[PDB]
């Protein structure tokens, strides 16, 4: 509900289904810097700080 003290989440040891994420209809806008989105779906990582 507020930007102040916003939530950080750590993601790991799971399938990060970017095929659904930033793909599904309700999603309004999305944009990546440093990596393109489709290639993002293809890449894999250490961990995520969301």
């Amino acid at each position: 509900a507020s930007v102040y003290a916003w939530n950080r989440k750590r993601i790991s040891n799971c399938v990060a289904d970017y095929s659904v994420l930033y793909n599904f209809a309700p999603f309004f806008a999305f944009k990546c810097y440093g990596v393109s989105p489709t290639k993002l779906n293809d890449l894999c990582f250490t961990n995520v700080y969301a």
Partner: protein, 49 residues
């Protein structure tokens, strides 16, 4: 160290090659040193630069 000269020649060549191969790891300002990664995680327009 009677054969200093011949040994010196060999060492110079070896060292030159070593530095040449080692210099592949430098990034020179690019976000990464390996080409494959650059071509993986970036679109062609930005990967070009």
């Amino acid at each position: 160290s009677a054969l200093g000269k011949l040994q010196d020649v060999v060492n110079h060549n070896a060292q030159a090659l070593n530095t040449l191969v080692k210099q592949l790891s430098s990034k020179f300002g690019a976000i990464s040193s390996v080409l494959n990664d650059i071509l993986s995680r970036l679109d062609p327009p930005e990967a070009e630069v």
